[PDB]
Amino acid sequence: IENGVSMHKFLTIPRLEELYNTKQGPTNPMLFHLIRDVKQGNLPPGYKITLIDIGLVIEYLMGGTYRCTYTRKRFRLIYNSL
Amino acid sequence: WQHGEESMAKALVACKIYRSMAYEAKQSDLVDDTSEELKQYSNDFGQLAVELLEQSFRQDETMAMKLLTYELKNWSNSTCLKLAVSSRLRP
Amino acid sequence: QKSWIESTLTKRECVYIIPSSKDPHRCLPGCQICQQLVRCFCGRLVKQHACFTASLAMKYSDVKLGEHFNQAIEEWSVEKHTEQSPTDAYGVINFQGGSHSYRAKYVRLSYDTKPEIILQLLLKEWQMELPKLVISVHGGMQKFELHPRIKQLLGKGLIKAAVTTGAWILTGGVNTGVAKHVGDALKEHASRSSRKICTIGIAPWGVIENRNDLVGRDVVAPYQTLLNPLSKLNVLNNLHSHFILVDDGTVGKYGAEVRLRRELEKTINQQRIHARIGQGVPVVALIFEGGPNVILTVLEYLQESPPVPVVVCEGTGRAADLLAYIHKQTEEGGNLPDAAEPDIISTIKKTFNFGQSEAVHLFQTMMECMKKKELITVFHIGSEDHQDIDVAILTALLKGTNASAFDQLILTLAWDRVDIAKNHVFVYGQQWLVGSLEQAMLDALVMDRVSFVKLLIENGVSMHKFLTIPRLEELYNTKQGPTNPMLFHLIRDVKQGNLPPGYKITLIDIGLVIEYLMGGTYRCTYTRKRFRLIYNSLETKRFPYPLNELLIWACLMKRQVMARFLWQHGEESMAKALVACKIYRSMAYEAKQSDLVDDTSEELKQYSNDFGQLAVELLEQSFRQDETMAMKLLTYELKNWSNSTCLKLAVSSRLRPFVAHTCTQMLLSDMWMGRLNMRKNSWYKVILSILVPPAILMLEYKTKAEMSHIPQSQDAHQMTMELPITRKFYAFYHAPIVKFWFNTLAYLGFLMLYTFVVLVKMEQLPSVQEWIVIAYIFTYAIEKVREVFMSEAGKISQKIKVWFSDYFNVSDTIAIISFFVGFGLRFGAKWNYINAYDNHVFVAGRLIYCLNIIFWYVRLLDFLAVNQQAGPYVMMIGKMVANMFYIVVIMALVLLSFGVPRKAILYPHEEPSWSLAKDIVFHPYWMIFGEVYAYEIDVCANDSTLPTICGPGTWLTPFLQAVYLFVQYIIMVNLLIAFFNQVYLQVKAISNIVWKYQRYHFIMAYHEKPVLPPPLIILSHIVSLFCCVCKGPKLFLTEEDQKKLHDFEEQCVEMYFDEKDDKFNSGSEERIRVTFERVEQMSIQIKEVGDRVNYIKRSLQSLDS
Amino acid sequence: GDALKEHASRSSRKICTIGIAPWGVIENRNDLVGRDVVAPYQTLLNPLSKLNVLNNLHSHFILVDDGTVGKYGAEVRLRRELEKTINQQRIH
Ligand SMILES: CCCCCCCC/C=C/CCCCCCCC(=O)O[C@@H](COC(=O)CCCCCCCCCCCCCCC)COP(=O)([O-])OCC[N+](C)(C)C
Ligand SMILES: CCCCCCCC/C=C/CCCCCCCC(=O)O[C@@H](COC(=O)CCCCCCCCCCCCCCC)COP(=O)([O-])OCC[N+](C)(C)C
Ligand SMILES: CCCCCCCC/C=C/CCCCCCCC(=O)O[C@@H](COC(=O)CCCCCCCCCCCCCCC)COP(=O)([O-])OCC[N+](C)(C)C
Ligand SMILES: CCCCCCCC/C=C/CCCCCCCC(=O)O[C@@H](COC(=O)CCCCCCCCCCCCCCC)COP(=O)([O-])OCC[N+](C)(C)C
Ligand SMILES: CCCCCCCC/C=C/CCCCCCCC(=O)O[C@@H](COC(=O)CCCCCCCCCCCCCCC)COP(=O)([O-])OCC[N+](C)(C)C
Ligand SMILES: CCCCCCCC/C=C\CCCCCCCC(=O)O[C@@H](COC(=O)CCCCCCCCCCCCCCC)COP(=O)([O-])OCC[N+](C)(C)C
Ligand SMILES: CCCCCCCC/C=C\CCCCCCCC(=O)O[C@@H](COC(=O)CCCCCCCCCCCCCCC)COP(=O)([O-])OCC[N+](C)(C)C
Ligand SMILES: CCCCCCCC/C=C\CCCCCCCC(=O)O[C@@H](COC(=O)CCCCCCCCCCCCCCC)COP(=O)([O-])OCC[N+](C)(C)C
Ligand SMILES: CCCCCCCC/C=C\CCCCCCCC(=O)O[C@@H](COC(=O)CCCCCCCCCCCCCCC)COP(=O)([O-])OCC[N+](C)(C)C
Ligand SMILES: CCCCCCCC/C=C\CCCCCCCC(=O)O[C@@H](COC(=O)CCCCCCCCCCCCCCC)COP(=O)([O-])OCC[N+](C)(C)C
Ligand SMILES: C[C@@H]1CC[C@@]2(OC1)O[C@H]1C[C@H]3[C@@H]4CC=C5C[C@@H](OCCC(CO)CO)CC[C@]5(C)[C@H]4CC[C@]3(C)[C@H]1[C@@H]2C
Ligand SMILES: c1ccc2c(c1)CCC[C@H]2Nc1nc2ccccc2[nH]1
Ligand SMILES: [Ca+2]
């Protein structure tokens, strides 16, 4: 950051999809347990997490009427587009 | 957290994420506890907010009360004082 | 427009097309290549000239057909071939990435902007407060390199000599010039993250990357600095606030930006520093490593008028090295070693890869530089030359612009740099025209510059000479400095109206404030006839004691740091710190009362209590030096502060740590004795002497050499001067301790009689024991009437308000009224001879007595509180009754929670009644106090006192009552116990102070109480009033004793300001602080020095080998 | 006197400097003319001045009076004549 990485340029959708979907670093087993709960089922075998699935967590974690950028129609439409 | 903006709404969302994760840990036991490692992580964010409110209240008591009620619009049209109440942050 | 910026400023665009190349490097029909690779003297390409009409001028090749006298065009007039337009850019650069998204601003203006047009946006649009200094940096444009010492040391100064001042640094902005290194200092030496040094970096629209990103009206340009070495456009340096993007119509090239830089650096030298100062904001110039055009422009400052100085530093590099290398030669300019001019030109030859044909004029340019070796401050970075660079810059301005030491002082007074003054203005032999020093004090005072006040006092400004009437009239009437809005609100109140439009405050109007703030009978010098006559008239137009007039000024204008400075100077330091504490405290109460501005009211009560603690810490220092004289310091009439006292002031400021200090508590006891010596005597002998008057003569009195420190009455001092027997009875009976124990034995003879009347039957007429009782209260009433009329004031509205403000003057009024209601109904009534107590008027007054009696037994806690063990419990019995009200409301919510069900469940056939108001409150209250009503619980049980209350639902009450008492005793009563345990140590360390402070008002009520007790005090009223129809306790010091006392106060103040100095400078946390700061400054001169040693030994062994 | 301030001892009866002054090189000589008078003395550092102001940090003075003004003289006589009788008084 102190040598010229403006996160606006480096935070695209597919990059940040990885950052959740990496065992290549310190991981939290809750996140793969939360996502399978809100989906109300069982994750398929491979299952790269989608950012929609994260919104369904944070809107579940924060709770009440919290509505995250990920679940909204704008993001949900440019996401399935790409 | 310390980078970006909205540093008082980010430290009260964080404190509510962890706190709401910790309560899932205690509820379901599929792994090691982790649940007191988070409640110390939440209360670490839920104390930078409070120590940042004081720093504002000690600079302008008026505006520092606007910092508690301005609709945020990045954090779901919410408030830096409705979050704390949701994290049950008393300080 | 909604934007004054683009309403005023404009933008240059090349509105015409001028090719600059003709030869077809490729594709012989030049029209094709001229499209994409033939640029204008506009700098931009011929097709980048969109300019909508010029976009259609992208015909076959462009404007001006190929031949057109081939060499014809090649000029690009910036006047008509480059028109103006409203600015399309103006926003805030984001600098996305690098430190918390630090901000900066711009417009993209044209250099067309006249110099005055450029200044009149920087202030009002960007809200950049006017500077005290200007540190334009005119060094090298191409990047250069420095040594680790000079890198950070020059980064100390550009932070130091600019954070103190305002210092609009003028840079190039780009991250390649001097703009590069200056920004690196702003981060390494990152000041307190605030409005730091606002660097106003003029940028060209030429060497600039992301120029398109700047094109936005109110747009946060998402700017990002690429360090791509293939890049050529220069990115703006990171640490720079507000930019000026000078727009010449061209791109990539230099030019116009240099024009603006003079043209703002010349109008800021035309703006004034501050309303008080008449000078203009000066301008300096700093050089880092320079260049060929630099050596030219360094000089023209030294030539042009006004003589803008320069701070060319020697260590930086190429040009600046040699401009300073020549300073080590070429002594006083014209003297020139002709053998060195080949040598230095040989140094010029090697640095700039420089020509010898050009070696005369560039060398010549360094001559007129050296002809002006007075204001070219060649800072020798190596040594301590003139100091660290911070001082060098500020020192360069003073010494060199042909300015008087006054004119040098008025600048440093604006900068608020005292160290400049103590070591470059107050140095040595120097003219110091005395009238000048005076005028400078007038300016340091109106602002707040305490440090120059101290400086000027310590260089010969006797305030007696400099405090005349018209000067001090200003000091109130200046908005040219930190002001207090109260003062203009107080003055319009006491005048009872509205100030006229202009209204310079008169010092009379101030007296009407201080006599209102301090209050009571305080009468200030200003309102008196002497001052009021010499004032309207206009060394008589001076003041006797000036720092008594400035100290009441700095406390009305909320200038603490001056008040602490003017307090510690002068004399009467303990009366000045208790007047101040009363001024602020009396200002704070006006703030809370009227809300026309921000509160300010807790900013003062901390300012008062800061003066009301230096007094107390100065009493202790005296009491610890001579307990006797230190009790004279509390009672000597002051005569500068309205014939007042350093202990009547504290009482008016309600300052408890002074009145309840151990020196105001010995004196109050030495005043409690009187002439008696109740050290040698005993309390038995007082009472023995009051009832046996001859035993007065067998008492051990004090001598008038022991009563020196005690204040004595008017005629009391007359006695001692001119022990005889008539002066034994006068000395005893006029002692407070005697006045006390001569009432307490009439009052305890009052309470033994009234009690006797209360308890014993009461006949048609009062008895002997009852007339004496009426007589006490009457004469006790009069004694409280007279206590009003003589309560040392003029306002009846204020006397009456301070009388009823004491707890007992009300209760006594309740108890005196009630008694004569009682005697009214008791005596003013009929008599039913067959049976008394049938007359409900008689009964009524009878029962006023039996209840009025309670007022008089609680009096005894006034008398009983004289003791130092008892009183501090009598004061607790109140501070808990207050703080416990809410535990006791709950206990009455629990008491009706039980009483209303218990009374409904058990007594269900109740018509409305007043017994439903008792019976829901009665038993549940006595339950709290040991009672259970055991044979009334379970009314259906066999062992019942209430076998008639049995019926449907009455089995619920044992449960209700079980829950009730559990809540009362086991929860709420132990909440009281727990309360009284934890509010005991608090209220005990307060009830002492509340007691020691009511002691003043008790003892100093006996010094003006009569001698005779309130059954026969009437004689001492009779024999004070009919004698009054025919027509305080002061410290009588001779003349030398005033002198010995003043010598004592001066001595004790000196120690106070000297022991605090020791307790801090020779503590621990301060001593770790110094040991840190030493080992800092050591370790710098360890590694530096120790390096050099190694650079010797590696040589020394090679010198000999 | 400059040492008496830089190294300002505990503010008390410090070293009582008994500075013999002549009635010669002395400014504000008229201000000194007062029987039991607090001479409102002020040191002017006017470089145009020629009369020498008393140094700040000095307690008790001896203003030796020769009848003349501006010139030296008599003061040196006293200085032996006190420095010779104090060598005649005993320490204790
Ligand atoms: C014998 C048969 C009849 C009598 C038996 C029954 C007697 C009933 C009980 C009586 C108890 C009497 C003592 C308490 C009353 C206050 C005393 C006082 O000085 O208070 C204050 C004066 O505060 C003021 O503001 C100035 C004057 C207030 C007068 C208020 C009278 C209230 C009592 C109504 C009349 C009752 C008379 C009923 C009779 C018609 C002193 O201060 P403080 O109180 O320590 O604290 C408050 C602080 N304050 C000053 C900022 C406010
Ligand atoms: C420092 C200031 C604080 C102290 C305040 C001090 C002032 C004190 C304040 C007092 C105010 C209270 C009111 C006045 C009291 C009487 C009220 C009353 O009811 O009177 C009654 C008697 O009235 C008579 O005239 C006959 C008896 C003599 C009156 C003696 C009371 C006045 C004494 C005052 C000496 C005070 C001077 C003290 C010296 C300064 C009238 O009613 P009644 O006759 O019962 O009705 C008949 C009914 N029946 C026939 C059916 C039976
Ligand atoms: C159902 C029953 C329910 C209860 C009924 C009531 C009973 C309980 C209550 C009783 C008294 C209520 C009124 C007076 C007290 C109020 C004031 C106080 O508490 O302290 C205040 C004054 O007072 C003092 O500082 C001194 C305390 C005086 C002692 C009280 C005598 C009680 C004895 C009577 C024995 C007679 C017994 C027999 C009677 C027949 C001090 O408080 P503070 O915190 O400093 O506040 C600020 C003060 N300031 C503004 C001056 C700075
Ligand atoms: C939730 C928190 C925990 C609570 C703890 C337990 C709570 C309490 C539990 C108590 C146990 C239950 C007791 C009542 C049982 C029935 C009584 C009955 O049948 O008749 C009785 C009627 O009298 C009553 O019913 C009155 C209620 C009893 C007293 C309540 C307890 C209070 C003291 C203890 C509270 C703390 C004790 C602590 C416990 C160790 C008597 O017989 P009878 O003949 O019908 O009446 C005489 C009429 N005759 C003369 C006309 C014939
Ligand atoms: C805890 C250890 C001790 C033992 C525990 C074992 C418990 C066993 C208990 C069992 C209760 C049942 C027995 C009574 C019914 C039979 C008839 C009877 O006597 O009726 C009575 C109703 O009195 C009651 O109903 C009593 C209270 C019932 C609740 C018992 C306590 C609950 C537990 C505790 C928590 C409760 C809350 C407490 C606060 C937290 C009326 O009879 P009387 O009063 O004589 O009136 C007769 C006259 N009359 C006809 C004119 C009206
Ligand atoms: C305002 C201030 C005044 C100052 C005080 C001095 C002036 C006041 C003094 C005296 C006034 C009274 C004089 C009149 C004659 C007395 C008659 C009488 O009652 O006699 C009784 C005694 O006396 C008492 O019982 C009442 C008087 C004395 C005790 C109460 C007051 C004590 C306080 C004041 C002194 C100590 C103070 C110490 C405190 C530190 C005896 O008679 P009896 O009981 O009726 O029974 C007789 C027998 N027979 C019925 C069978 C026949
Ligand atoms: C300055 C302030 C003054 C205060 C107000 C002054 C008020 C003055 C008020 C009254 C004076 C006049 C008295 C007569 C009243 C009319 C009724 C009447 O005549 O007789 C009736 C009296 O009935 C009662 O109730 C008498 C007692 C009431 C007194 C209440 C005072 C409260 C003040 C508390 C202390 C205040 C403390 C203040 C603290 C600051 C009945 O009696 P009778 O008919 O004569 O004959 C017997 C009847 N029988 C046949 C049935 C047996
Ligand atoms: C007529 C014949 C003669 C005898 C009659 C008189 C007998 C005596 C009467 C009372 C008792 C006091 C006697 C001892 C006094 C010692 C001196 C002393 O220190 O006094 C203190 C208290 O001073 C007071 O005045 C306290 C109040 C007493 C009078 C009111 C009665 C309260 C008690 C009744 C309540 C109801 C209880 C009812 C219980 C049934 C004040 O001084 P200090 O600050 O403590 O001083 C110590 C340091 N110094 C000395 C160096 C200064
Ligand atoms: C020891 C206590 C009694 C003596 C009273 C005399 C001393 C009282 C002295 C100081 C205390 C506080 C100030 C005085 C009260 C003013 C009103 C008030 O504050 O109301 C408060 C609510 O209060 C309620 O809601 C109470 C209403 C019901 C009163 C019933 C009394 C019950 C006790 C009857 C006995 C049954 C006992 C049963 C068995 C134990 C409102 O809060 P506030 O005003 O913002 O707060 C205080 C602000 N202040 C401090 C600046 C003023
Ligand atoms: C009458 C007024 C009513 C209106 C209220 C006044 C308000 C209060 C004002 C003022 C207060 C003081 C003066 C008035 C009260 C005392 C005088 C008095 O009334 O004596 C009475 C005589 O009483 C006796 O002969 C019995 C013993 C007492 C005599 C000495 C008086 C008491 C005070 C001594 C020590 C302190 C004094 C020393 C000071 C240096 C006369 O009263 P009377 O009602 O005319 O007579 C009725 C019948 N009787 C004769 C049987 C009693
Ligand atoms: C917050 C708290 C809740 C509880 C409570 O305080 C406030 O609410 C209050 C209301 C009161 C009643 C109002 C009116 C009357 C009528 C009157 O009728 C006279 C008739 C006749 C007599 O014979 C005249 O001749 C008798 C008294 C009674 C019932 C009051 C009793 C006390 C009560 C219950 C008070 C109780 C302590
Ligand atoms: C009950 C008891 C005393 C008191 C009150 C209430 C209300 C305030 C006045 C106070 N009286 C008092 N007498 C004193 C004698 C000596 C020193 C301090 C004293 N304070
Ligand atoms: Ca009990």
Length of chain C measured in residues: 1105
- Asked if C462 and D46 come within 8 Å (Cβ–Cβ), the reply is no
Residue closest to C559 by CA, chosen among C613, C489, C484: C484
Q: Do at least 3 CB pairs under 8 Å connect B with A? A: yes
Q: Find all residues with CB under 8 Å of C690, minimum gap 6, and list them.
A: C738, C741, C742, C745
Work out the number of other CB atoms within 10 angstroms of the CB of residue C127: 8
Residue closest to A29 by CA, chosen among C403, C1034, B28, B79: B28
Helix (H) / strand (E) containing C82: strand C82-86
Q: Pairing mode, if any, of strands C200-204 and C170-171?
A: parallel
Strands (E), C109-191: 135-137, 170-171
* Dihedral angle over CA of C873, C878, C880, C882, nearest 10: -170
Report the distance separating Cα C110 and Cα C11, nearest Å: 5
Work out the number of other CB atoms within 10 angstroms of the CB of residue C813: 14
Asked whether C668 and C1000 are in contact (CB, 8 A), the reply is yes
Asked whether C554 and C566 are in contact (CB, 8 A), the reply is yes
Ligand 4 atom closest to C942 (CA): 50
Asked whether C40 and C15 are in contact (CB, 8 A), the reply is no
Nearest chain B Cα distance for residue C101, angstroms: 7
> Which ligand has the minimum distance to the alpha carbon of residue C824?
2
Residue C854 C-beta-side C-alpha neighbours within 13 Å: 5
Work out the number of other CB atoms within 10 angstroms of the CB of residue C422: 16
Work out the number of other CB atoms within 10 angstroms of the CB of residue C1026: 9
> Could you give the 3-state DSSP secondary structure of residue D21?
strand
User: What is the Cα C170 distance to its own chain's centre?
Assistant: 34
* A56 contacts chain B (CB < 8 A): no
Phi and psi for C189 in degrees, rounded to 5? -95, 50
Asked whether C630 and C621 are in contact (CB, 8 A), the reply is no
User: What is the Cα C222 distance to its own chain's centre?
Assistant: 42
* D84 contacts chain C (CB < 8 A): no
Nearest chain C Cα distance for residue B2, angstroms: 8
Asked whether C528 and C537 are in contact (CB, 8 A), the reply is no
Residues C352-361: contacts with CB under 8 Å, at least 24 apart: C352/C292, C352/C318, C352/C319
- As beta bridge partners, residue D19 has D61
- C483: which 2 tokens? 């002001």
Report the distance separating Cα C511 and Cα C583, nearest Å: 12
Give the sign of the dihedral formed by CA C906, CA C909, CA C914, CA C917. Answer: positive
Q: Cα dist. C440→C85, C282, C418, C447, C791 in Å?
A: 49, 19, 13, 11, 48
C-alpha angle with apex C289: C284 to C291, nearest 5 degrees?
A: 95
Report the distance separating Cα B68 and Cα B55, nearest Å: 14
C991 Cβ below 6 A of ligand 12 = no
Helix (H) / strand (E) containing C1020: helix C1018-1030
Tell me the DSSP string of C651-701. HHTT-HHHHTSSHHHHHHHHHHHTTB-TTTS-HHHHHHHHHSGGGGGGS-B
Nearest chain D residue to C1061 by CA distance is: D10
Asked whether C126 and C112 are in contact (CB, 8 A), the reply is no
Report the distance separating Cα A44 and Cα C148, nearest Å: 60
Asked whether D15 and D28 are in contact (CB, 8 A), the reply is no
Please tell me what DSSP assigns to residue C497.
S
C-alpha angle with apex C538: C532 to C542, nearest 5 degrees?
A: 75
Chains touching C by CB (3 or more pairs below 8 Å): A, B, D
- C440: which 2 tokens? 């400078």
Residue closest to C659 by CA, chosen among C1014, C419, C165, C998: C998
> Could you give the 3-state DSSP secondary structure of residue C1034?
strand
> Could you give the 3-state DSSP secondary structure of residue C395?
helix
C1068 Cβ below 6 A of ligand 11 = no
- Which mutation among C906, C959, C964 tests ligand 4's pocket best, with the greatest number of atoms within 8 A of CB? C959
Q: Using a CB-CB distance cutoff of 8 angstroms, which residues of chain A are in contact with residue B30? A: 29, 33
Give the sign of the dihedral formed by CA C684, CA C690, CA C694, CA C699. Answer: positive
Helix (H) / strand (E) containing C92: strand C92-93
Q: Pairing mode, if any, of strands C135-137 and C284-286?
A: parallel
Report the distance separating Cα C683 and Cα C1007, nearest Å: 19
Q: Pairing mode, if any, of strands C104-105 and C92-93?
A: antiparallel
Pocket of ligand 3 from Cβ distances under 6 Å: C 807, 854, 858, 874-875, 877-879, 881-882
> Could you give the 3-state DSSP secondary structure of residue C246?
strand
Chains touching D by CB (3 or more pairs below 8 Å): C
- As beta bridge partners, residue C274 has C277
* D67 contacts chain C (CB < 8 A): no
Report the distance separating Cα C62 and Cα A53, nearest Å: 58
Q: Find all residues with CB under 8 Å of C350, minimum gap 6, and list them.
A: none
Q: Pairing mode, if any, of strands C272-274 and C277-280?
A: antiparallel
Report the distance separating Cα C685 and Cα C743, nearest Å: 16
Residue closest to A60 by CA, chosen among A79, A41, A75, A40: A40
Nearest chain C residue to D41 by CA distance is: C462
Nearest chain B Cα distance for residue A37, angstroms: 11
Helical residues (DSSP H) of C460-572, grouped into ranges: 469-476, 485-494, 507-517, 529-537, 547-554, 560-568
Q: Is the peptide bond preceding residue C306 cis, with omega within 30 degrees of 0?
A: yes
Ligand 6 atom closest to C775 (CA): 1
What's chain A's Rg over C-alpha atoms? 14
Report the distance separating Cα C140 and Cα C290, nearest Å: 4
Q: Do at least 3 CB pairs under 8 Å connect B with C? A: yes
Asked whether C107 and C10 are in contact (CB, 8 A), the reply is no
- C244: which 2 tokens? 């000026």
Cα C768 to ligand 6 centroid, rounded to whole Å: 9
Report the distance separating Cα A30 and Cα B18, nearest Å: 11
Residue with token string 């439903």: C916
Asked whether C214 and C245 are in contact (CB, 8 A), the reply is yes
Report the distance separating Cα C880 and Cα C885, nearest Å: 8
Length of chain A measured in residues: 82
> Exposed, middle or buried, C580 (CB in 10 Å: 0-12/13-18/19+)?
buried
Work out the number of other CB atoms within 10 angstroms of the CB of residue C695: 15
Q: Find all residues with CB under 8 Å of C373, minimum gap 6, and list them.
A: C327, C330, C332, C333
Tell me the DSSP string of C34-79. HHHH-BBTTSSBTTT--TTHHHHT-SSS-SS-S-STTTS-----SS
Q: Find all residues with CB under 8 Å of C341, minimum gap 6, and list them.
A: C363
Report the distance separating Cα C301 and Cα C365, nearest Å: 12
Report the distance separating Cα C670 and Cα C683, nearest Å: 15
Please tell me what DSSP assigns to residue A70.
T
- As beta bridge partners, residue C85 has C11
